[PDB]
Amino acid sequence: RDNIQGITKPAIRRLARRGGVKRISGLIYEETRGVLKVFLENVIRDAVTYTEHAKRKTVTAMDVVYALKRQGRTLYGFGG
C-alpha cells in the first residue's frame, strides 16, 4: 500500500541532479511517479508472461533481460 510514495521526494531530487536538472518544481514529482508506474507495468507484464510460459513459480533475472530485449532498451551485465 502507497509504495508509489516509497519513491521519495529526495529520490526524485537525486535522479534529477544526476541527469542534470537544476530547478525542480513541486508538480513534477507525482507525474514522475506515474511515468515510473506505467513503465514498470509494461515491464512486469512481460516478465510475468515469460515466467508463466516457463511453468515456474519464480521470476528470474534472465526473463527480465529477455523482456527488455523485447522492448528495445537492452540491458547488459547481468547475463544473456
Binding site: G19, G20, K22, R73, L75, Y76, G77, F78
Partner: protein, 105 residues
C-alpha cells in the same frame, strides 16, 4: 596447425562459433570460412573497445577496468555511440555533462 584458431592466427575460437552457428536456425548449411570471418570481426570490435577502456583506466590511473570506465569509453567515441545508443550498461552513470546556461555568470 591443428586448431583452426591457430590456422587463422586469432583468439576467438572459430570452433565454438561453429557449434553455435550449427544450433542457430540460420540457414541449412554453414560454410567453413564464414565463422573465421565472423571471429575476426568480433576480435576487432573487442580490441576497439578495450583500447578505449585502457585509455579510460589510464586517465584515472586505475588498474582494474571498472564499468564506469567502460561507459565513459563508449560515450567518448562517436561511432560507438551511434551503434550502441539504444544499449544501456549497468553500473554506468552518464557523461560528466554540464549545460551552458546552468553555470552561474
Amino acid at each position: 596447425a591443428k586448431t583452426r584458431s591457430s590456422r587463422a592466427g586469432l583468439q576467438f575460437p572459430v570452433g565454438r562459433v561453429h557449434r553455435l552457428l550449427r544450433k542457430g536456425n540460420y540457414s541449412e548449411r554453414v560454410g567453413a570460412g564464414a565463422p573465421v570471418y565472423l571471429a575476426a570481426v568480433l576480435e576487432y570490435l573487442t580490441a576497439e573497445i578495450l583500447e578505449l577502456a585502457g585509455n579510460a583506466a589510464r586517465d584515472n590511473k586505475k588498474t582494474r577496468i571498472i564499468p564506469r570506465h567502460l561507459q565513459l569509453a563508449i560515450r567518448n567515441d562517436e561511432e560507438l555511440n551511434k551503434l550502441l545508443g539504444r544499449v544501456t550498461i549497468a553500473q554506468g552513470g552518464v557523461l560528466p555533462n554540464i549545460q551552458a546556461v546552468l553555470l552561474p555568470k
